[PDB]
Structure formats: C-alpha cells, structure tokens
Amino acid sequence: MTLSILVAHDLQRVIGFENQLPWHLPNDLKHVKKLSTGHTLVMGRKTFESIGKPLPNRRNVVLTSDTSFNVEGVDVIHSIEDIYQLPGHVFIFGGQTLFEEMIDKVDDMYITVIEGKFRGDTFFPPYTFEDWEVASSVEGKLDEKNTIPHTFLHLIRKKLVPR
Numbered sequence: 001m002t003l004s005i006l007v008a009h010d011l012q013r014v015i016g017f018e019n020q021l022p023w024h025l026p027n028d029l030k031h032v033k034k035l036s037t038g039h040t041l042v043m044g045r046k047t048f049e050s051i052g053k054p055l056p057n058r059r060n061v062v063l064t065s066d067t068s069f070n071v072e073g074v075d076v077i078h079s080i081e082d083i084y085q086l087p088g089h090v091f092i093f094g095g096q097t098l099f100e101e102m103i104d105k106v107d108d109m110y111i112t113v114i115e116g117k118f119r120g121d122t123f124f125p126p127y128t129f130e131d132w133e134v135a136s137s138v139e140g141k142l143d144e145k146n147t148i149p150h151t152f153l154h155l156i157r158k159k160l161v162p163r
C-alpha cells in the first residue's frame with residue numbers, strides 16, 4: 001500500500017469554501033481522474049457529501065463515525081487505523097480533517113497549487129519544502145475553460161540523515 005495525499009490548494013493553502021472547491025478548474029479534476037483511476041480514494045464524510053456520489057472506476061472509501069452510514073458503491077471505515085489495511089495505492093482525498101490527520105503519515109503528496117487567493121473556510125496544513133523533495137513540478141496549461149494558473153507538484157518525503 002503506497003499512501004499518498006491528493007489535494008488542490010491555493011497560495012494561502014485554502015482548499016474549500018462552504019463544502020465546495022473555491023475554483024472552477026476542469027483540468028485539475030482530469031488530473032485527479034488520471035492519478036486515481038483504478039486505485040483507492042479515502043475521504044472524510046463531508047467531502048463525500050459534497051461530491052454527492054462515488055467517483056466511477058476506483059474504490060471509494062469514506063471515513064465517518066456514523067455506524068448507519070451505508071451508500072451503494074462506497075466502502076466505509078470508522079477509524080484512521082483502518083486506512084492502513086487497504087490494499088494498493090491509496091489516496092487521501094480530503095478534506096481538512098483527514099489531511100491534518102494524515103500529512104505526517106503519507107509517503108508522498110500530489111498537490112495542485114492553485115496560483116491565486118480565494119476566500120476559504122478550510123485549509124491544507126502548513127508544510128515546508130525543507131521536508132519534501134520536488135519529484136516533479138509541471139505548469140498546468142491555460143485555455144478558455146481553465147483560466148487560473150496552476151502547478152502540479154509531486155512531493156516525496158525527505159529522509160532524515162546525519163549531516
């Protein structure tokens with residue numbers, strides 16, 4: 001089980017406003033689709049309710065304390081510890097709560113930096129590039145449907161070594 005974070009955050013690490021993405025950026029949702037098809041998404045309950053339905057062609061896992069929670073096409077877990085029993089490549093998909101709980105545990109992060117400043121009410125936790133190697137950094141292409149500059153980062157946790 002490779003464990004990754006998958007997230008879009010803006011210049012101030014805003015990830016959400018009123019249970020929605022603050023930005024309209026089709027290409028990032030395509031990026032998300034390409035990375036996670038055939039794999040597993042782990043998400044908190046609020047993030048799932050925002051999307052409204054499972055994303056097709058991958059395993060949709062929802063973390064919640066609700067023992068009544070049962071949705072067709074969705075697997076449910078009730079603790080963080082359950083994440084580690086999931087097979088394959090697992091992506092931590094959001095939202096703020098799950099990111100805060102997992103950022104110290106994941107192998108790597110796929111971050112789309114939205115190069116703007118949006119009003120938000122939910123944030124990605126602060127992190128420093130002193131701790132994370134830039135495996136790749138790719139500028140998103142802008143066009144008629146995708147008008148906010150954005151950058152795809154793949155960050156891998158650096159190892160702590162003596163001097």
Ligand SMILES: NC(=O)c1ccc[n+]([C@@H]2O[C@H](COP(=O)([O-])OP(=O)(O)OC[C@H]3O[C@@H](n4cnc5c(N)ncnc54)[C@H](OP(=O)(O)O)[C@@H]3O)[C@@H](O)[C@H]2O)c1
Pocket residue numbers: 006007008009014015016017018019020021043044045046047048050063064065066078079080093094095096097098099101122
């Ligand atoms: N920009 C991005 O890439 C991105 C990605 C995803 C989401 N978002 C945004 O993030 C925002 C939502 O984040 P959020 O923190 O408010 O909600 P969230 O993390 O999506 O969901 C929180 C819920 O997850 C469940 N949960 C979390 N940790 C748990 C644990 N250890 N044990 C049991 N249950 C647990 C609880 O559900 P119960 O209360 O049901 O027990 C909790 O209330 C939205 O605005 C959304 O638009 C942004």
Ligand SMILES: COc1cc(Cc2cnc(N)nc2N)cc(/C=C/C(=O)N2NCc3ccccc3[C@@H]2Cc2ccccc2)c1OC
Pocket residue numbers: 006007008019020021028029030032033047050051055056092093094111112
């Ligand atoms: C809070 O709301 C949301 C949060 C996130 C998390 C997220 C956001 N961004 C980053 N970077 N990380 C992330 N964790 C995500 C979504 C998007 C879901 C979604 O609709 N899709 N996702 C892939 C997918 C795969 C198959 C079919 C449809 C889709 C569509 C896009 C699409 C539509 C048509 C064709 C191709 C793709 C979302 O809802 C707006």
